[PDB]
Structures are given as C-alpha cells and as structure tokens.
C-alpha cells in the first residue's frame, strides 16, 4: 500500500525555499520557487538573492537548496526516510567543510505548508579566506554529478549522510566540499529507517535572460540506488 507520506508526492508539488545566511559576517537572504516531481526525481527551481549581490558563489549553495523529491524505485520504497517523515517534516543539519578554507553549518526544516513543500534554511559560514575560492568568487558556474551516501541512525530515529562535492575552479582545479549530515523527523510518529544506499544526483545551472537580480536557475535529477535474479 501507499503510505501517507508517499501519497503527498504522487503529482507535481510547488516548492518554496527560504534561506538566511551569514558567511564571515556577510549577511544575505535567498528566496527560491519552483516545483518537484518525485515520480521522475525532478527539481526545477529559481533562486533570487533578495539582499543584493550574493557574497559566495551560487554553486556552493546547491546542496543546501528537498530530498523528499528523490525518485525511489518501487523496490526501494521501504528505504525512503524523507517522504515517510511527511507532512510533519524533518530537520536536516549539515556541516560542509571547504578544503583549505572555511565551513558552512546549515539547519533546514523541510515540511508542508498546505500544498507547498517548504525548505527553510539557516546558514552560518566561518573561517573563510577573504581571497579564497569562495569569498574571492573563483568557482565556475557549473556542477558535477555526485552520489550521496545514506545510513540509518536508529538511536536518533533518523539518518546520517556523507558525501564529497567537487566544485570546478576557474583555473581547472577543484575545490572539495566535504558534507556531513543528519536528518531527523520533526514529528513523533514512525519513519522509515533505511538500509545503506545512495542517491545519484545530476544538476544543471543556468540563468534567466530576463532576470536582472542576482539569481540561479537549477534543474536537478535525483534517483535512489544501491539496493537490488528475476531475470
Ligand atoms: Br556564481
Ligand atoms: Br551546469
Ligand atoms: Br543530507
């Protein structure tokens, strides 16, 4: 049978993203809007910096900007923590360590407000080099494909996640961003605690030719894998 969480994602769902950020004292806010289609693992989102110029590169915020929209194959449905926590939601905590630079700490509350799936985020960045790849804006406006590794954390009724992002630097090198995370339900009800598996991501970044504010358009596809002889 289809669980209450799953049922909320059977069609296209509007998304609202709100972020308040402070990186080495540079304060900024971002709002985003778009839609998610969990059946296809598809996210289409446009983000605006509402405070002026974004003080870090857009690609460094991609991982922060709704894993409930991942496509879980039917055979892996019992491993979909994110949908099982809905509609009450879940809290994602991350630390993102930029190699030879600073770190972000993020807290995101992901929950429904009516028909809208909301991702409300606080981001704090410290210890950045004012002339490094992040504050010095040396990252290319593009994005590579990565796997995100998920394991159960029974003690916390949630999951622990880790992965490495490689951001292309303008000189042909790479800036590593090591992500460590936990996701835990907001509500007190049962959730699905998964076996080890991963999410496979691909992301494309673009610009709206009619948009004069600092912004990012994101197209992202996310599919669960790692757990699989009928043939
Ligand atoms: Br950028
Ligand atoms: Br891209
Ligand atoms: Br995560």
Swiss-Prot record:
<keyword id="KW-0455">Luminescence</keyword>
<comment type="similarity">
    <text>Belongs to the GFP family.</text>
</comment>
<keyword id="KW-0599">Photoprotein</keyword>
<dbReference type="InterPro" id="IPR011584">
    <property type="entry name" value="GFP-related"/>
</dbReference>
<dbReference type="InterPro" id="IPR000786">
    <property type="entry name" value="Green_fluorescent_prot"/>
</dbReference>
<dbReference type="GO" id="GO:0006091">
    <property type="term" value="P:generation of precursor metabolites and energy"/>
</dbReference>
<protein>
    <recommendedName>
        <fullName>Green fluorescent protein</fullName>
    </recommendedName>
</protein>
<dbReference type="GO" id="GO:0008218">
    <property type="term" value="P:bioluminescence"/>
</dbReference>
<comment type="subunit">
    <text>Monomer.</text>
</comment>
<dbReference type="InterPro" id="IPR009017">
    <property type="entry name" value="GFP"/>
</dbReference>
<dbReference type="Pfam" id="PF01353">
    <property type="entry name" value="GFP"/>
</dbReference>
<keyword id="KW-0157">Chromophore</keyword>
<comment type="function">
    <text>Energy-transfer acceptor. Its role is to transduce the blue chemiluminescence of the protein aequorin into green fluorescent light by energy transfer. Fluoresces in vivo upon receiving energy from the Ca(2+)-activated photoprotein aequorin.</text>
</comment>
């Amino acid at each position: 049978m289809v669980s209450k969480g799953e049922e909320l994602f059977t069609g296209v769902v509007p998304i609202l993203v709100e972020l308040d950020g402070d990186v080495n004292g540079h304060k900024f806010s971002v709002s985003g809007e778009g839609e998610g289609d969990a059946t296809y693992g598809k996210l289409t989102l446009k983000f605006i910096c509402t405070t002026g110029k974004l003080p870090v590169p857009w690609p460094t915020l991609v991982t922060t900007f709704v894993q409930c929209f991942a496509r879980y194959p039917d055979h892996m449905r019992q491993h979909d923590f994110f949908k099982s926590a809905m509609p009450e939601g879940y809290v994602q905590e991350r630390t993102i360590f930029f190699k030879d630079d600073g770190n972000y700490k993020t807290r995101a509350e992901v929950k429904f407000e009516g028909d809208t799936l909301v991702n409300r985020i606080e981001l704090k960045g410290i210890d950045f080099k004012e002339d490094g790849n992040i504050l010095g804006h040396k990252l290319e406006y593009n994005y590579n494909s990565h796997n995100v590794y998920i394991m159960a954390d029974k003690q916390k009724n949630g999951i622990k996640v880790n992965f490495k992002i490689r951001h292309n630097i303008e000189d042909g090198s790479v800036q590593l961003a090591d992500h460590y995370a936990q996701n835990t339900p907001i509500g007190d009800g049962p959730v699905l605690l998964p076996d080890n598996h991963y999410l496979s991501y691909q992301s494309a970044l673009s610009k709206d030719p009619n948009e004069k504010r600092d912004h990012m358009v994101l197209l992202e596809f996310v599919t669960a894998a790692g757990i699989t002889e009928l043939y």
